[PDB]
Amino acid sequence: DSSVNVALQASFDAGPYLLELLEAAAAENASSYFPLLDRIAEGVLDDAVTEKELYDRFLTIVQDEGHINDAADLSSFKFSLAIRSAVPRVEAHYQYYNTSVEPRLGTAACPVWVHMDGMQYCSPTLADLEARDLPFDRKLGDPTAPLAILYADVASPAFGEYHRKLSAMAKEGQVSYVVRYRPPPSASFRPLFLAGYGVELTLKRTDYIMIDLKPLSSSEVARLGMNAASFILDSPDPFATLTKLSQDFPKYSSAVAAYNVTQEFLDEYYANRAASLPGGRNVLWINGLQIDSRQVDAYSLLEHLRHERQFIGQFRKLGLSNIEALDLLLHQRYDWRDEVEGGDVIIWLNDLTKDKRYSDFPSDIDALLQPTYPGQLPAVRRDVHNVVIPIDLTNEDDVYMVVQHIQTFIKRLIPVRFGLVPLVHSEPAKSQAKIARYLQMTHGLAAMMKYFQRALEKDKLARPDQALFDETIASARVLRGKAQSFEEALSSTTLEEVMDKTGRYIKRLDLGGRSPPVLANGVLLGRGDNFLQELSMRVAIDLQLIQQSIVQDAVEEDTWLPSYFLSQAALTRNELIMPQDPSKIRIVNLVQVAESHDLTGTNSLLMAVVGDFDSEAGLNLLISALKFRLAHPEIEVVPLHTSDTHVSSQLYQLLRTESEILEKIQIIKSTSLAYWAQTKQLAADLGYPSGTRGVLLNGRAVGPVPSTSTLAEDDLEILLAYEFSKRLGTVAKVMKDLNLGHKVAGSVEFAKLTSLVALSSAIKTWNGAHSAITVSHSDDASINIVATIDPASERSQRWVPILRTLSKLNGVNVKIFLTPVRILQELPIKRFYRHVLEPEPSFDEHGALNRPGASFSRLPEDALLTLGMDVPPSWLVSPKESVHDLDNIRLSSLREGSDVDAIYELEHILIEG
């Protein structure tokens, strides 16, 4: 008889396997690129291009690189070729060149050439589409005004001597150089078979049902899962047992029914409720770090695996063991009321406790129950819900918001109270605000809108004309009017202290600029995003939290309910430093084996105040920073700056003869070598390019922004406190808590460690006695994969081969906890599975790369089986045509010795939009 085979092919076809080498090379350590290229220019792969000489003459080359000749980097790289994937970047260079370059070119005799500022030549002696920094590019030289874009197929000696001393230009320092590859004649491509997918053969009609010819089993099944583990655990070599067992579960089933489950059936069934607390599910960790079941894929794993080894690899800089380091790694509202200065900044359109729209319905709090959503809360005149909407009366969007439906909710008796702060963030936005304020203050409570109503609509609010002003003063319709001013409302009684009073409330709460958030019971709602239903929802959330309060353990009627929301621990400020709307936390370290290493009280945390001293926010940040160094003497600061004058020059001996003294020097300066060389540069690399500014705190970054004291002292240690946080403070208290005096004594090197932890979690895995198929060294595996694998899940079947492939990677521990199901209510794994995934591209040949595939020999006939595919979410794939129904496969009905050689196709993936 014979079998059933499956392979899978990419729609588009690969170029010379050689490129894929190069791009797989920098896939590991990326700096590898050009240096390889430097020497390969000398063509030590320039003899025959058959894949394995250039392959092995390649490996013997890259093992001349410390970048990729680590212990295991070089294994990761093996994997990446058995891993199909260096081609895609290669494919990019092509798709650009085929669509963006060769079309826009016209007419050729020259086969390789560069883009320089215009045209060029087929000779290396030295225009509507420009030299733009494309995604796949690699810059050689530092990136300035000049760019040299080399187009060439790197494979033939034909190219050879362009680069060699176009490798002589940045070298001296002239034009920035980047290499983009050429596509060959369309006849050069040879095909591309893939891996990292799985092949289903599910039992469509079978006797393998519950109550070689064709399996059976009954309701010894809740057991089937149980037992399946001991079964694996009692074989001499268990991991291998694991593998065959999963592969073809349904046929082995009626066997595994009569083999009861062993002693660490249950000392790990309650020992799962201490360590490793999943029961029967599949989760995966890489160094304790859970992976999600949607990236249990070969690709994902690979680039996670090595954006893990270096991060840790980054620790042996300080000289560490790390059987120690990763058991090292283990162990919302804002105040909205304008009170704080003044007491009538905010303009409240609504007032529950006073507006008569909200009639006379009682305030009984405990009568505040059972709502249908035609009515989220009964009508009760309590202060509960408060929404503060910051507005630019210059912004048209804003006004339309309020004039129609801020106005309607009120009107539709919604028990929510609304208010505005007028943004005073432009010469016109204030004036309107001025105007605005002046109406309810003199010409009372409706004129303003019924100004802004008519101002909004057919006039445009872009600027406030008084022509309109005087017309609505005449109106007092709904209104009326005491405290006259009229005219040009240029009063001093307004110009600043409703204005700075609005002015700082804003800047208190950080609401300047283009679009400021919304205050919904203290929680910020981005107005940029839709929010009106999130408003409607964050209320109905916030509602119950109060109902939760009152129903239970609560206060009586003599308490102000919004206190409840507002009573947290978090006061009154910024969305940048503490950016918990975009949870953008920039951590910046690691990478400082730069051209820096400049060296310049116990352990101490570390702050740099990087600035543009000599200017706006220059000293203003710096003085703010310094009154801060006093307030908090814990840390010594190292300021740095970026400009393009002899007035920051005592900055350069703040104390340099061997500070506080200085902290008054610059305030007496406020009204009146090559340090700089590195500062800005080595600033610009921490963000803070070219003048742009903020401060660092021991790995914590900020950035630059709009005004000059937005980064003030108050801000600095609301920064520190939840910078100190459960982040960088605690680092101190887990010390070498574990022991040694310190290998990280310094405050500079402590600064370093604090970064890495902030890059980060799933706290603990433990109890494996002899109830765990271990598959690696527990020691300084500079990778730890733990994973729990249910012997009888379907999900497990992908997982296992991957693990063998992963485990058979060098320096990649893999350990497996069988965690079967309590009581399998039905038959799990009703299919056959094997997985296409090798850890090195293999050969075994007449000389050419192996096309990865599957092979289904030894299957029960007489009954229908279905071939499906198992593969990443992003993959679209079709099966080519055949005499056989690939859904309907009954090996009986067939002819002997012949079989089914199926080949699916990766037709691109998924472009939608």
Numbering used by the authors: 29 to 135, 139 to 157, 166 to 250, 283 to 402, 415 to 683, 694 to 737, 742 to 755, 760 to 773, ...
What did the study's authors say about this model?
We determined the crystal structure of the N-terminal folding-sensor region of UGGT (UGGTN, residues 29–1142) at a 3.1-Å resolution. The overall structure of UGGTN displayed a C-shaped structure containing a large central cavity with 60 × 80 × 120 Å dimensions. The N-terminal Trx1 domain showed a unique Trx-like fold in which the four-helix subdomain was not inserted between β3 and β4 but preceded the α1-helix. In contrast, Trx2 and Trx3 domains exhibited a typical Trx-like fold comprising a four- or three-stranded β-sheet surrounded by six α-helices, in which the four-helix subdomain was inserted between β3 and β4. In the present T. dupontii UGGTN structure, the α6-helix was ordered in the detergent-free condition. The Trx4 domain represented a typical Trx-like fold comprising a four-stranded β-sheet surrounded by six α-helices, which, however, exhibited an unusual topology. Namely, in the four-helix subdomain, one core α-helix and β-strand are encoded by the N-terminal segment (residues 275–410), while three core β-strands and α-helix are encoded by the C-terminal segment (residues 897–950). Such uncommon domain architecture was also observed in the β-rich domain comprising six-stranded β-strands, which are encoded by three discrete segments (residues 29–39, 231–244 and 959–1036). Although we hypothesised that UGGT possesses a β-strand-rich domain comprising residues 942–1149 based on the bioinformatic analysis, only the N-terminal subdomain comprising residues 959–1036 gave unambiguous electron density, suggesting motional freedom in this domain. In the central cavity of the UGGTN C-shaped structure, remarkable hydrophobic patches were found, suggesting their possible involvement in folding-sensor function.
Remarkably, the quality control system is equipped with an elaborate backup mechanism employing a molecular ‘gatekeeper’ that can specifically catalyse reglucosylation against incompletely folded glycoproteins as potential substrates, thereby regenerating monoglucosylated glycoforms for their return to the chaperone-assisted folding process. This gatekeeper function is executed by a unique enzyme, UDP-glucose:glycoprotein glucosyltransferase (UGGT). Our results reveal that UGGT has a modular structure in which the 35-kDa catalytic domain is tethered to the 125-kDa folding-sensor region. The N-terminal folding-sensor region is composed of the four Trx-like domains and the β-domain assembled into the C-shaped structure with structural plasticity harbouring the central cavity displaying hydrophobic patches, which putatively accommodates incompletely folded glycoproteins.
